[PDB]
Every structure is written in structure tokens, then in C-alpha cells.
Amino acid sequence: MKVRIATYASHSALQILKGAKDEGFETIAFGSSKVKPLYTKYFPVADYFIEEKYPEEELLNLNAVVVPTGSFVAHLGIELVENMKVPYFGNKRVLRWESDRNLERKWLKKAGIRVPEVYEDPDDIEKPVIVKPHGAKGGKGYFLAKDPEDFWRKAEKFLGIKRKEDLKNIQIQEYVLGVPVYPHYFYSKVREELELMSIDRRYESNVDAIGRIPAKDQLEFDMDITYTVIGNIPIVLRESLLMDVIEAGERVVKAAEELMGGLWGPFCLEGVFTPDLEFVVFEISARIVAGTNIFVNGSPYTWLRYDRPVSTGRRIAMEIREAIENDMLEKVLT
Amino acid sequence: MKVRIATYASHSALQILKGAKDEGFETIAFGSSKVKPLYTKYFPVADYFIEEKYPEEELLNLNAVVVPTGSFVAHLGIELVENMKVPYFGNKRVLRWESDRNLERKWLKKAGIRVPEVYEDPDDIEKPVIVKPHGAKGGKGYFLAKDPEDFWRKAEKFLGIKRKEDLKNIQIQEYVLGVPVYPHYFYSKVREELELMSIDRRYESNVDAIGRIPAKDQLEFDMDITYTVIGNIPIVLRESLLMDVIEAGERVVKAAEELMGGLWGPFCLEGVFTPDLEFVVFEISARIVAGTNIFVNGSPYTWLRYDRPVSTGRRIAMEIREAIENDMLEKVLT
Amino acid sequence: MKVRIATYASHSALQILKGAKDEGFETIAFGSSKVKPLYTKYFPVADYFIEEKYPEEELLNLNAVVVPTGSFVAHLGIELVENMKVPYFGNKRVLRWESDRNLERKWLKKAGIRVPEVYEDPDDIEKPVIVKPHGAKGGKGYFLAKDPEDFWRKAEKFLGIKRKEDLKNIQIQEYVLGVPVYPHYFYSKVREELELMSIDRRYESNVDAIGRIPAKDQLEFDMDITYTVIGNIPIVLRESLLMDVIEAGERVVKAAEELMGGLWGPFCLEGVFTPDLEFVVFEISARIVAGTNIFVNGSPYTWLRYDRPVSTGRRIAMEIREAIENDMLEKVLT
Numbered sequence A, B, C: 001m002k003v004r005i006a007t008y009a010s011h012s013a014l015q016i017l018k019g020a021k022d023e024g025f026e027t028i029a030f031g032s033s034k035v036k037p038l039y040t041k042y043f044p045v046a047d048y049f050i051e052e053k054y055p056e057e058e059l060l061n062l063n064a065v066v067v068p069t070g071s072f073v074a075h076l077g078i079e080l081v082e083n084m085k086v087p088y089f090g091n092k093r094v095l096r097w098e099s100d101r102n103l104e105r106k107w108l109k110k111a112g113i114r115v116p117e118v119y120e121d122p123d124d125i126e127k128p129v130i131v132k133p134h135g136a137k138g139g140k141g142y143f144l145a146k147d148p149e150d151f152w153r154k155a156e157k158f159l160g161i162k163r164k165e166d167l168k169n170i171q172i173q174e175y176v177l178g179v180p181v182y183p184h185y186f187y188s189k190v191r192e193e194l195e196l197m198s199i200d201r202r203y204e205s206n207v208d209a210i211g212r213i214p215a216k217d218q219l220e221f222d223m224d225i226t227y228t229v230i231g232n233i234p235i236v237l238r239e240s241l242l243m244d245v246i247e248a249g250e251r252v253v254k255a256a257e258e259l260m261g262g263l264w265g266p267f268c269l270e271g272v273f274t275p276d277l278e279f280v281v282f283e284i285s286a287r288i289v290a291g292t293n294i295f296v297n298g299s300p301y302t303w304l305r306y307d308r309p310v311s312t313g314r315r316i317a318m319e320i321r322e323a324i325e326n327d328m329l330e331k332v333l334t
């Protein structure tokens, strides 16, 4: 293989590079020198490790294609990623839509996806809400509020926002009481087909630790609720829920084709399921998510349609190999 | 194979039909036109899709044997299923025992299984209870009550029961504080052997969502607790607990042989494990349960005794195949 | 194979004996006659079952090497295990270091592992604490105290403690609010190398059941919080946390080399992950833990570096085999 698969050494590089290896690619990890043993000693999946944030020149010399991990754009910056000369697997135009909460909402609405209600004016708050500070990833700064007046008290406490607006591009969103579900998709541009790869429940601290503390005991912890991502727990869904989850994925792809020149490769809809079986989506994560890391040896969904273990990392490598073999590699790269 | 394997297009049909494929059976899904793509496009495991609730005529023409799913008896009704001319994998006589809470309880008691205390008279309520509306499936309408007068308030609210009796065959049950555990079994009539297939913990909304909300913020939601089934999470048990769980299944099978002409094929005991390590069971589900859907690529338990992936779906197809090969297919069908 | 692999019939014997089987060893289970069917009928993994707590003479005649399980030291007692003539996979000198919570902490400190604050004087309690009775196993007898006043009231109720003079070797430990995580390690003495085998979240009763009860309803239960081990749930971690977890294992092995003549074979670091991504460790479990039982068919981590399913049990058998073939069997046995 002429093409090598390259990834930023974080988030899901082990899965991505093992999958590339399994498909006959030579593999490149780049990033901190601190994490190098992980990819070369403990799990020898990287044929090359480059101790640089973005080694453009060497990657071009190695015929690298970058498979973006879930923190690649974060560590490098969206300006650098969009001007990179090294080929990028997926559509770069998708990046602006997922960095803007209003563009996220516009995308979801067009794709006919159920979303929580949003309030521009805090005085209109009619039900418990979750407040999302601008540009926040990983749920940092998030806090809960019950009514218009509880919001102002906490807005001044956490964000310093004096009463009566000056709301620095925060999002005030209806808190939806449902169980967290994260379906992982893959859209094949080569096969013109959408697949369900797997599903997980993200494991977050301290939010998934507080239910172990009895109600009576919680006060003296002086608890602030945090949504720091720690890990992932494998799940399957109720089978009768699969069709609407998959259709939601189809509409998301179709909407992206009409808004941003398409969505292909891995993606995830992060949301909850309510007691009335509704899937309410908080965001479209148009990338490989950490949840796919469970399924190195395939998932309960891939094993229904494949004779071998297929992770999202392997599926990415499969797509790139098939694009090369079908003489259409440029079609999946931007 | 002469015999084709047919299932209702919901609940566990993907697993069942994939398992049948793996054992050399042609496959049939029947149900809603809405779900056809799931079984023919996204996961092509059904060689025939029939867009009818119960196409008896066509099923007989195709030499079908019906493997019952979770939704099958409910959608088609207990009487139709009882009188169906199409062969049914498992014992149909079991259905009347599981549709009645008094009969379930008698069956469990005879099998020496730990069950929660029940209350006929609401005045006798001394510890917290769970109230189960008549005929209710999937946790529909369940509510908690602390004492007699608190029961009466909520019974009027949720069920329209005026104070002082006329309890329309409602079940009032001791709430057992233990962790939900769902062992999945298979009894082979061909082998005369009980197997432990897998274990899961069912994932339910909003009940598994409320522990993410701090005590102080819970009252703002006006939470009615619900047990809508959303998905399934894989587990294993502490090893010293397996013998008790396996002996429980043996007694359940032995009790069914003396009561209802036997229990064979898949079943699940649904319950909790308390701090004193006791397995308290709420019901026997005498069918394939959704939790088995995790284990398409086998389970930590099947991989201890097989050299290949064995789901409950595949295990059924194995049983049917070996029955045909041992000229005893009629023994496993009613 | 001359050498046979022997193990006490509990905790993780199924995984261990199946692992030995896969590596070409004849297998021995020893323990209660009550559990014999588990190991010989339901999962036929034991070539020999001996109905004795510790059958030294028979084990010597069968050329046995004992792979220690969870309850092995508990059942036999520390001194008998220290004086056994049958070879022991691992370092027996480790046993005193993990039986003593002071020596545990001395080991953790030398290994530069983050640990919770400990209180010798209950008047100094400024944050909520967990109280651990002397020598308590399986988290039993543990209770939460939220302040100095709450400690004395619960210490009197549960233990009969009235003042500082009679604290009777209880450990008062800062309650760390974080999600439970249990990484499973293997240090190969043959290959002089540390591996990450898998990770789980231990499933405990009633602590993991109480979050299903709404805060308003919790007081009616009069809850004693318990940490009784019931089962295990598979997880993966966030990728950027793996080096943290792996380096922690390295320092534990290194500190053991200076302190106790080394640590090889399976071990686990039991702890939590806080919102600021700290791995705070409660104890070193210097043995195979029950969380490994999920991964009979390998783990999301072993599948990154192996072409076949590798459990901790199999990995142990691999080590013993390779030690024999490299003529260094005596190096891994005490």
C-alpha cells in the first residue's frame, strides 16, 4: 500500500491504527513524546511515531492520510486543520457546523431530529434547564437551573453574569430526563450506504458517581455536577428502537449533503431516550467517538453482518482501501 | 434444511435469524412494513419478509417453525398463539403460567425460588412497596408507596382507585433493594442439559437516568419513576454465585415438568441481588429476552465451553437442527 | 506438559482453568463438593476435582502449581499459604503487604500513587469519609460519615466505639467522589514487561441499587449502605488516561522489587476517576480479580496486541508455559 494511515496520538488512535494494520496499511501516530510507549511498546500499533503536534512535511513524505481523532481539531485548532496540506479523511466543511451550537441546531432541525427546547431569554424558562457556556467541550461549566430566578443566581455565581442579560453566547437548554445513549454510525461514500457500527453509554465523572451517595449524605459534599468523560460502557438497544435510530442517521447524512457537501465516515448522535421511547439528541458528533474503543473485536451489530471483527477504526481502513481499489480516493478526502 | 426458521419482526429477531443462518436454515421475518429495511438491508438476516401480523398460510407453505420473541404473544394475543397451526419452538402451555402473577408466584414458590413478599390488604404495608397494575408489561404504570395512606393517595392518582379496596387484581409487592441481574438460560431437551448462556443488566428509563440528578435538584422535575426498557448492558456474576443461579434454573425446569408439561429452550429469571447475596426473583420470563442481543459473538459463559460464538439465537437453531438430526423435532415443538 | 495447573474452586477458577486448558495444561480444581458440578458438568474445565480445602499431598503427586484465586488466602489463612509445599504462581511475600492497610499505604506512597487522605483523629474530619473496619474483606462493615458528629453516632451503632482511645484499628478515609475504575494488569517475569489486560467496573449491592430510588423515597428505606460484590461490568477508559494507569502499574511493580522481592503475574489497582482526571487508588489487589472474568474471549485491550482471545487466566498459563520452555519456571514460583 502506497498510502499510510496517520492519526493524532490520542482519543482513539489505538483502535484506528490497529484497524489500519488489519487492512494492510503502515501506520503513523504523531503527538506528545510522553504517550509514545502506549503506541509502540504497550500496544505496538504505530510503525512510525513522530513527536510533533502536526509534522506536515514528514507526513507528506510518508504518503500519510490523516484519520481525525476526537481531539485532533482541539489540539491543533480549527484554522490549522482547515488549511492542512496532508489529506484529511472525511469532510472538513463539517467542522464549522459542529463548533457552532446554532449551526448544530440548524443541522439537527433540517434533519428532522428531536432536540431539547432552547431559551434565548431566561425569563421564559418554564422547566428545569442545563446551561452551556460558549465554546465548551466535554461539558465544562455546565450547571442546572429550575426557574428564571434560580438561573440568575447561578449565572452570576458560575459565569459572573449580572442579572438582566449580557449572556455571553451561552445556551440555555431544557434538561431532558432520559438515559444516555450514543449510537455510532458509519456512512460509506464508496458503497453509498449507512451502517450502525455499535452503541455505548459514556462514563462520566462526577455525574455517574453521585447516585452511589444516599440523598441524605449528598449535601455535605457541596457537590458541583461535572460531566468529565472518563470511559465507555458497551450497550445494545431495544431492537424496535433501531429503525428510528438508523433513520435519524440517514436524515443527518442527507441534510449534510444539502448543507455542507456531505457527511461520510464515522459519526455519532449523542442523546437520551425518554420513558415514551423518544430519542432526543444534544449534538451530532461528526467523527469517531471514544465509545467505539470497546469494539476492537467487533460489536453485537457488526457481528450480525460480518464474518470477522470490525471496529470503526477497521471500517475506516476498509473504506480507504476500497476507495484506493475503486480509484476514488479523492472522493473521501478533503 | 426442510424446516425454515420464522420469527416476529421485533425484540430479538436479528439475533434469532442470524443464529439460524449460522446453522444452515433459511429465514423468515414477519411483521410491520416499517421495519422491513432493518432485516433486509441494514442487517440482511431474513430471506423472506412478510408484511403481515401472522401470515399462517404462507408460514405453513414455507415449512416454518416459529421461534417466539418478546413481542410475539403480546402483538398477536394469547388465544391466537395458543391455537396457531404453525409449529412453535418451546412449550405453549407455559404462556398461561406467565400471564398470571398468581400462577407465576406458585411456579416460583414450588421451584424454591426467593420471591418478594406480597400484600393483599394495603393496610398491612409496613415497608416500601412497588405497585404493579393488572396485566401491565414492561413496567407500565408501576409506582412506589411507603405506607397504607400514601398508597391510597397514589392509587387514586395513577389508577383511579377510590380509597378502601376494589383493587382491580393489582399486585402490591415488597420493594427489594438489590442490584438488577438477569441470567439467561437454555434448557436443551435434545441434550437433557441446562446451560447458562449469558447474564445482563437491563437498561431502563427514566429509572436509570434519575441517579444522575442530585437529590437537591430532583423535586424540580416532578418525577414519576418509569421502567421503560431502552437497552441492555453486559455483566458477569461473582463466580461463587453461579451455582445458586444455575440450581435455581434447574428447579424452575423441574417444577415446569410437574406443572405444565415441561420448560425447554430459552428462559430468564428476572430479579435482584441483595447485600446478603440472595437472588430475589420478580418473574420467570419463559422466552428469549432482549439481554441476549449483546451476545451475538458469544458470551463470557459460552466461550468457557464452546470453540465458536454461540448466542441464544444460535443455540435455538442448534437445538432445532440436532432435533431434526436425531428424529425428535416434534419433541421440541408444540 | 509435566506441570499441572491447580486452583481453589472459587472467584475466577473457570477462567483460570479454561486458560490453562487452552495452553495445553491438565487442570485441577480444589474446594467444596457443593461447587464441583460447576467445574465438571456445567463448565467442564477441571480434569481433577479434589473435595478438600488444601490437598497438599495429592497436589504434589499431580505435579501441581497453584494459581491463587480471590478467596484462596481467605479460606486457607495467610500462614498456611505462606508455608505450603505446593508451588505458588507469584510472590508469596506480597501477601503480608496487602493484608496490612499500613503496609498497603507504604507501598502506594513509594509507588507515587495518589491515595485518599486518612484521619487518625475523628475530630479532624473536614470532609465526608468512609470508615473501614480492621481487616474487612469485600468492603463489608464499611459506612459513610459526613462530619465528626455523624462519625461518633455511627461508630457507636455499628462498632461500639465511644472515644479516640478505642478506635480499634479502623481506617477513616476521605470519601473520594469519582467513578469506580478497576484496571487489570499482568507483569510478565519471563518477558520482563508490564501489560494492561482489561478494565472493569465492579457491580456492588446495595450501593449500585440506591440510585434507582428517587431522593424523596429514600428515607423510607432506612438504608445501611453496603458494598457487597455481586458482579462486573466491562469498560474501556478514555485513551489519554491509559498512560496514567499504565505508569501507575509500572511504579507499583518497581516499588515491589525493592520492598518485597518483586511483583509478577496478575494484579489490579482499585480506585476512582475524579472530575479533574485523577486516578485515586484505594488498594492494590495483587492477584487476579473477578473483573477479568468478563474477558474469557479477550478484551478491547488484548485484541489490540494479540491475534487470539487472551484472558488473564490464559495469560497466566502462557507465562507458566513460556517459563518451562525458557527453563526458568522456578523464577515465577514461590
Ligand SMILES: Nc1ncnc2c1ncn2[C@@H]1O[C@H](COP(=O)(O)OP(=O)(O)O)[C@@H](O)[C@H]1O
Residues within 6 Å of the ligand: A116, A130, A136, A137, A138, A139, A140, A173, A174, A175, A176, A177, A180, A204, A227, A270, A271, A272, A282, A283
Ligand atoms: N439538554 C440536556 N438535558 C439533559 N442532559 C444533557 C443535555 N445536554 C447535555 N446533557 C448531558 O451533558 C453531558 C454532555 O453533553 P454534551 O453537551 O453533548 O457534551 P459536549 O458537547 O461537551 O461533548 C452528557 O452527559 C449529556 O447527557
Ligand SMILES: Nc1ncnc2c1ncn2[C@@H]1O[C@H](COP(=O)(O)OP(=O)(O)O)[C@@H](O)[C@H]1O
Residues within 6 Å of the ligand: B116, B130, B136, B137, B138, B139, B140, B142, B173, B174, B175, B176, B177, B180, B204, B227, B270, B271, B282, B283
Ligand atoms: N419487588 C420489586 N422490588 C424492586 N424492584 C422491582 C420489583 N418488582 C419489579 N421491580 C423492577 O421493576 C422493573 C420491571 O420489572 P418486572 O415487573 O419484572 O417486568 P415487567 O413489568 O415487564 O413484568 C424492573 O426494573 C425491576 O427491577
Ligand SMILES: Nc1ncnc2c1ncn2[C@@H]1O[C@H](COP(=O)(O)OP(=O)(O)O)[C@@H](O)[C@H]1O
Residues within 6 Å of the ligand: C116, C130, C136, C137, C138, C139, C140, C142, C173, C174, C175, C176, C177, C180, C204, C227, C270, C271, C272, C282, C283
Ligand atoms: N476512600 C474511598 N472513597 C470512596 N469510595 C471508596 C473509598 N474506599 C473504598 N471505596 C469504595 O468501597 C468499595 C470497596 O472498596 P475496597 O476497600 O477497595 O474493596 P475491597 O478492599 O473489599 O476489594 C468500592 O466500591 C470502592 O469504590
